[PDB]
């Protein structure tokens, strides 16, 4: 469910006709389920963002805040960016992620999937600003 | 005028005699008032001697009517004590004083 | 005038759960004996004189509130009127320590003991130095409460009591006719130490703050039966009822093996009543007749409508099957009716329990009350014992069933907990986690900083909370939201000032409302930052954690850790102070913003002095309880200077308002309840050559005259709060040294004195003193207008009202602290520093 269910949200991004499709089926039965699907997914899928809780992916998603495409995402994974400050990274991010790390993310592939989910969260925040 | 009311541990025999350095780990108190002094906080239990007019003679008359190891509550009359004007800035006049005392007297 | 300081050791006390007093009825012999054994080596600690003393307390001491008190420090015991104390040359009450004589005037050395001879008939208390008598007692004191085993104590002392029951190694006899724990001691409980007002305990993981407890039957220690015309159809059926119960106890007899013979004997285990209800002997016939009638006499006062209902179950009466092993030498076969089907309800079984409590109470009436059976007894049937309760209930549970087979159809306040203001939060996303031990009344949430006490949580705008005792929320009254709790039940509590939202969570899941709204307190304005908060009703427990460490959070894996919400005490090296709510009623000045209590600094004219007139909104506003009003300036007498207090209404009145002759800093004050009039005033006047307070009024009875510095009762009555008297003696009890001391409200009852029925104005005239005038009141407090003999009213003077409660601070640290009479330890020291006002005389 972390690896998948985001392509559903990507299909939900475009095709406002799909927003129309939701309406006929709903009134046959609007804060639709369609946008409201991944809420628990957004809770628990981004557990292992990076180093489980580190949130260098926070700065990465800050980099992705341009409606960046997939090739742009791969380029940005080629770029890379992270920090190890003694600020509130400690208790929330590091001192709960590495204790939480039953298997810590140690690869560029993990950061690649993390920043892909960051671009997914960027599109989701665009959709949420559409809802509010 | 001096009137002792003793809590009596100790030998109750070896009075502090003249020409002797009596050492009391004391604390004062005022008549329906509050503290003004304590050897306990400063950790120097007041190594002085008797018959020398160092301390006021109320304290000395109390020192005469005690022993080693005992514990008394020493009233103090103002004319015996400081009180006609008092220690200025610290004690007003007509000061009737009270002293807790606990001592060894190495003579 | 100014702010003094010194360091004081944290004073403490303890209490075995033993409670003895007086009531019109059951007392359990009211005379008990004390034994204790000490082992300390610390008459002086590091700092000061180490402290130990002993006495009693009538469940209103509550000196444990460790901090400040009326003296210097919130000190131990014998520091009020509702508790007493003693440590060798002493009569402790209210920081008054006037001494006494005894053999061997030396204080609480180690390997020393004591006893306490409690009398209540003429209520007097003494003690006994280790073996020798004390020539000084307490007597002539109040009894509205139970009188405890108490020792107040300071650091570094070890001690053990001894009980009498199991390992009470009594060196010493009891005093004459005194009780070491035989008759009924914890009759539905066991023995344990129980330090009073213990609103915190050392927890396993986090410390379990707790609330108050209900007063354990100060009054209502006595039970009561129910105190008549039986119908004739009940008189008829009584014979059948008597016969059926007689068959039933014939069964329970022979199941043991108690067959019948006409002789009573133990080895053959006969019981000569095992015959028919009419063949029984005539006094025993009246006995069983009276039981079969008195079950109905208990049942008549229930609002029933009795009568032979149907006569359709009567012919349906089926008798149960009993073989010949239960047939016996009597020939009177036990033949009970079969009532497999006769079920009344769950409800009126409690009526049978009420009848059982009345049965135990008439037992009390027979044996203990009039009989007073000087031997081994029972106790109050409200809480006597579960076993005899259920037995006496099920005995009569079958009587109503047998009737229905015959067709006779029939039918003191909350504790509040808050962080301080320095940790107030204004922005971000924040989280803390409360744990619920009990599942009674308690309420948790965020709230504004200025939570006024003396009000329930959520009754105003200053709070947004959740009450899972009922599955409610609360904001200017209850509202429904979320499921309630059960025990354990980690509740998480969250907040986001970025978006004006509130998030309660319950063991790792967001709660919901009836509308499916995600914990709706929406568009909460920011205000003055925000503050977490908790509360607890009586008999309530639950600890928490502020995120002082993230591992200690039980869940925190659902709603905040990936979602911005922050542990509250995250980047700290220390916890919060955790301010809390008081119970004692300290005085506080008049807020000018009050709804219906308004004052007026009346300026003195030529032909009158100045004055202080109250004003009340004589309308639908609250004409509430008798608010004792006090002034600001005190008056310590010299050392005398009056030799008495004396009052005049308009002439010489009931004199001898009590003389004391020491400092005794008093305050003028008065009872007052609203008559929907303007209200009684407060003037300041010289008579001619002596100060006279003159409390002008029009309306009705409001009991004025002087009250001391230590006055702090809430309400319930203008009179009957003072009780303590000197009892000093000599070796042959020849010491004629006594005085009716403790004039807390040494003042005038006043309602009996003038004015049976009328409405003119009324004045009063107390005494000031007599000095060189050849006069006022104001001169003898400010000590600069002392010679100035005119009356004045400076702005330092501001009148007061005791509120019931204000706030106070929890210390961040606490003391450390058990067999062979339940020993107790103390080794580590503790102290603080303390301020104190001389004008008020409190720390």
> How many structural domains is chain B composed of?
1
Instruction: Count other C-beta atoms under 10 Å from residue C423's C-beta.
Output: 18
Task: Establish whether B59 is a catalytic residue.
Answer: no
Would you call B9 and C6 a contact, using CB atoms and an 8 Å cutoff? no
- Which approach determined this entry? cryo-EM
Return the exposure string of C560-588: e unless at least 16 CB atoms fall within 10 Å of the residue's CB, then b.
Answer: bbbeebbbbbbeeeeebbbbbbbbbbbbe
User: Residue A89: which of A114, A109, A59 has the closest Cα?
Assistant: A59
Query: Could you tell me if A30 lies within 8 Å of chain C, comparing CB atoms?
Result: no
Tokens of C743: 């004039």
**Rounded to whole angstroms, how far apart are CA atoms C777 and C756?**
31
Q: Tokens for C5, please give them.
A: 């300081």
- Using a CB–CB cutoff of 8 Å, tell me whether B35 touches chain C: yes
**CA of A47 vs chain C CAs: smallest distance (Å):** 7
The CATH number covering residue B29 comes to 3.10.50.40
Asked if C636 and B8 come within 8 Å (Cβ–Cβ), the reply is no
Question: CA B16 to CA B107: how far, in whole Å?
Answer: 8
Characterize the bridge pairing of strands C472-474 and C800-802. Answer: unpaired
Show residues of chain C in contact with B34, CB under 8 Å: 4, 6, 72
Is B82 among the catalytic positions? yes
- Is residue C642 within 8 A of residue C829, CB to CB? The reply is no
Estimate the crossing angle of helix C386-405 against helix C349-364, to 10 degrees. 120
Cβ contact, residue pair A43, C561, below 8 Å: no
List of chains touching C (3+ CB pairs within 8 A): A, B
Q: Work out the minimum CA distance from C739 to partner chain B, whole angstroms.
A: 20
CB within 8 Å: A46 and C561: no
Cα distance between residue C249 and residue C247, in whole Å: 6
CB contact under 8 A, C6 and B102: no
B40/C662 CB distance under 8 A: no
- What phi, psi does C505 have (nearest 5°)? -140, 150
B34 touches chain C (CB under 8 A): yes
CB A105 within 8 A of CB A98: no
**Residue C553: how many CA atoms within 13 Å on its side-chain side?**
28
Both tokens of residue C683?
A: 């003037």
Resolution of the determined structure in angstroms stands at 3.5
Minimum CA–CA partner of C4 in chain B: B34
The whole-angstrom separation of Cα B77 and Cα B58 is 7
Residue given tokens 């015991």 in the structure block: C77
Q: Identify the domain containing residue B106 by its residue range.
A: 1-107
Contacts of C543 (CB under 8 A, 6+ apart): C203, C205, C206, C207, C208, C209, C434, C435, C437
Question: Chain C interface, mutation test: which of A92, A121, A124, most C Cβ atoms within 10 Å?
Answer: A92
Taking CB atoms and an 8 Å cut-off, how many pairs form between chains B and C? 22
Give the position of tokens 């002792």: B4
Q: Residue C127, SS3?
A: strand
Cβ contacts of C571 on chain A, cutoff 8 Å: 88, 91
State how far Cα C488 lies from the chain centre.
Answer: 27
Which chains have at least 3 CB atom pairs separated by less than 8 Å from chain A? C
DSSP E strands, C578-705: 579-581, 587-589, 601-602, 611-612, 629-630, 647-648, 666-667, 669-670, 682-683, 685-686, 691-692
Distance in Å, alpha carbon of B57 to nearest chain C alpha carbon: 23
Taking contacts as CB-CB distances below 8 angstroms, the residues of chain C near B71 are 43
- Host H or E run for residue C39: strand C35-40
Burial of residue C330 (CB within 10 Å: 0-12, 13-18, 19+) is middle
Left, alpha or beta for B83 (phi > 0: left; psi -120 to 50: alpha)?
beta
What's the number of CA atoms in the CB half-sphere (13 Å) around residue C566?
14
Alpha-carbon distance C835 to nearest alpha carbon in chain B (angstroms) = 12
Task: Confirm or reject contact between B9 and chain C (CB < 8 A).
Answer: yes
C223 within 8 A of C24, measured Cβ to Cβ: no
Q: Do chains A and B touch (3 or more CB pairs under 8 A)?
A: no
The rounded distance, in Å, linking the Cα atoms of C492 and C503 is 8
Catalytic residue at B56?
yes
Nearest to A46 among C550, C551, C562 (CB): C562
Structure tokens at B78: 């103002």
């Amino acid at each position: 469910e972390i690896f998948i269910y985001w392509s559903k949200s990507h299909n939900f991004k475009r095709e406002e006709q799909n927003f129309v499709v939701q309406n006929e089926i709903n009134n046959m039965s609007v804060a639709t389920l369609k946008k409201m699907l991944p809420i628990g997914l957004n809770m628990c899928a981004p557990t292992d963002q990076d180093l489980i809780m580190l949130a260098k992916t926070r700065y990465a998603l800050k980099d992705t805040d341009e409606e960046v495409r997939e090739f742009l995402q791969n380029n940005l994974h080629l770029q890379g960016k992270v920090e190890g400050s003694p600020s509130l990274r400690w208790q929330m991010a590091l001192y709960r992620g590495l204790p939480g790390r039953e298997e810590d993310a140690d690869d560029p592939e993990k950061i690649v999937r993390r920043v892909q989910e960051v671009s997914a969260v960027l599109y989701h925040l665009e959709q949420t600003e559409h809802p509010y | 005028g001096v009137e002792i009311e003793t809590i009596s541990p100790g030998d109750g025999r070896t009075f502090p005699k003249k020409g002797q350095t009596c050492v009391v780990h004391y604390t004062g108190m005022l008549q329906n008032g509050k503290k003004f002094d304590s050897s306990r906080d400063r950790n120097k239990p007041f190594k002085f001697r008797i018959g020398k007019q160092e301390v006021i003679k109320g304290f000395e008359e109390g020192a005469a009517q005690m022993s080693l190891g005992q514990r008394a509550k020493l009233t103090c009359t103002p004319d015996v004590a400081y009180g006609a004007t008092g220690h200025p800035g610290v004690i007003p006049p007509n000061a009737t004083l009270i002293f807790d005392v606990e001592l060894l007297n190495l003579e | 005038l100014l702010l003094q300081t010194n360091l004081i050791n944290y004073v403490t006390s303890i209490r075995p759960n033993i409670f003895v007093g007086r009531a019109e009825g059951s007392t359990q012999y009211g005379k008990w004996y004390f034994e204790v054994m000490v082992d300390e080596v610390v008459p002086f600690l590091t700092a000061q004189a180490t402290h130990l003393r002993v006495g009693w307390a009538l469940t209103e001491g509550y000196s444990p509130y460790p901090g400040g008190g009326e003296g210097w420090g919130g000190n131990g015991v014998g520091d009020d009127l509702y508790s007493y104390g003693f440590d060798g040359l002493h009569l402790w009450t209210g920081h008054v320590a006037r001494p006494v004589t005894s053999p061997g005037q030396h204080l609480l050395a180690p390997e020393d003991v004591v006893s306490c001879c409690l009398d209540l008939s003429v209520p007097s208390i003494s003690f006994r130095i280790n073996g020798c008598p004390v020539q000084g007692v307490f007597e002539a004191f109040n009894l509205d409460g139970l009188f405890f085993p108490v020792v107040s104590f300071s650091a570094g002392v070890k001690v053990r009591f001894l009980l009498g029951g199991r390992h009470g190694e009594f060196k010493f006899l009891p005093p004459p006719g005194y009780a070491p724990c035989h008759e009924a001691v914890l009759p539905r409980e066991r023995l344990r130490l129980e330090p009073i007002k213990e609103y915190r305990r050392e927890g396993p993981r986090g410390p379990h703050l707790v609330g108050p407890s209900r007063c354990l039957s100060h009054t209502d220690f006595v039970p009561c039966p129910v105190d008549i015309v039986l119908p004739p159809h009940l008189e008829r059926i009584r014979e059948k009822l008597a016969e059926n119960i007689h068959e039933l106890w014939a069964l329970t007899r022979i199941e043991q093996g108690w067959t019948y013979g006409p002789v009573r004997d133990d080895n053959k285990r006969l019981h000569p009543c095992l015959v028919n209800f009419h063949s029984l002997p005539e006094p025993e016939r009246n006995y069983n007749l009276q039981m079969s009638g008195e079950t109905l006499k208990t049942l008549l006062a229930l609002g029933c409508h009795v009568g032979m209902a149907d006569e359709k179950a009567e012919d349906n009466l089926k008798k149960t099957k009993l073989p010949k092993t239960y047939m016996m030498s009597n020939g009177y076969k036990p033949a009970p009716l079969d009532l497999s089907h006769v079920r009344l309800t769950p409800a009126q079984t409690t009526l049978v329990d009420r009848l059982a409590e009345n049965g135990h109470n008439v037992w009390a009436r027979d044996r203990v009350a009039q009989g007073w059976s000087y031997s081994a007894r029972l106790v109050p049937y409200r809480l006597l014992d579960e076993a005899t309760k259920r037995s006496n209930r099920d005995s009569l549970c079958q009587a109503v069933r047998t009737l229905l087979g015959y067709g006779y159809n029939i039918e003191d306040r909350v504790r509040i907990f808050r962080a301080e203001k320095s940790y107030t939060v204004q922005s971000g996303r924040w989280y803390f986690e409360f744990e619920a031990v009990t599942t009674g009344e308690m309420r948790v949430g965020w709230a504004r900083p200025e939570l006024r006490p003396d009000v329930e949580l959520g009754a105003d705008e200053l709070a947004y909370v959740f009450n899972g005792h009922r599955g409610q929320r609360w904001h200017l009254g209850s509202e429904p939201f979320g499921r309630p709790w059960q025990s354990g039940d980690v509740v998480g509590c969250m907040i986001d000032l970025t978006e004006n939202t509130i998030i309660f969570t319950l063991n790792g899941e967001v709660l919901m409302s009836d509308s499916g709204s995600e914990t709706a307190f929406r568009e909460i304005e920011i205000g003055d930052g925000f503050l977490p908060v908790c509360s607890l009703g009586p008999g309530q427990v639950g600890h928490l954690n502020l995120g002082q460490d993230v591992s200690s959070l039980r869940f925190f894996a659902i709603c905040g850790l990936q979602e911005g919400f922050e542990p509250f005490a995250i980047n700290m090296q220390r916890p919060v102070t955790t301010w809390f709510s008081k119970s004692l009623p300290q005085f506080e000045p008049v807020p000018p913003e009050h709804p219906h209590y308004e004052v007026a600094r009346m300026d003195g004219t030529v032909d009158t002095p100045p004055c202080l007139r109250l004003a009340h909104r004589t309308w639908g506003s609250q004409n509430s309880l008798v608010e004792m009003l006090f002034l600001r300036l005190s008056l310590p007498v010299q050392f005398t200077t009056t030799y008495y207090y004396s009052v005049r209404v308009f002439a010489g009145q009931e004199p001898s308002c009590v003389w004391v002759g020491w400092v005794t800093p008093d305050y003028h004050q008065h009872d007052m309840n609203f008559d929907l009039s303007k209200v009684r005033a407060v003037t300041v006047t010289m008579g001619d050559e002596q100060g006279n307070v003159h409390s002008s009024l029009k309306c009705s009875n409001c009991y004025m005259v002087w009250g001391g510095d230590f006055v702090s009762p809430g309400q319930q009555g203008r009179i009957s709060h003072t009780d303590l008297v000197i009892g000093c003696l000599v070796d042959l009890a020849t010491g004629l040294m006594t005085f009716t001391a403790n004039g807390k409200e040494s003042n005038t009852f006043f309602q009996v004195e003038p004015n049976t029925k009328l409405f003119p104005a009324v004045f009063v005239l107390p005494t000031h003193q007599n000095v060189i005038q050849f006069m006022p009141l104001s001169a003898a407090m400010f000590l600069s207008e002392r010679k100035n003999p005119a009356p004045q009213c400076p702005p330092r003077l501001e009148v007061q009202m005791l509120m019931p409660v204000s706030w106070s601070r929890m210390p961040n640290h606490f003391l450390q602290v058990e067999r062979l009479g339940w020993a107790v330890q103390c080794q580590d020291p503790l102290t603080m520093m303390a301020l104190h006002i001389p004008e008020e005389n409190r720390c």
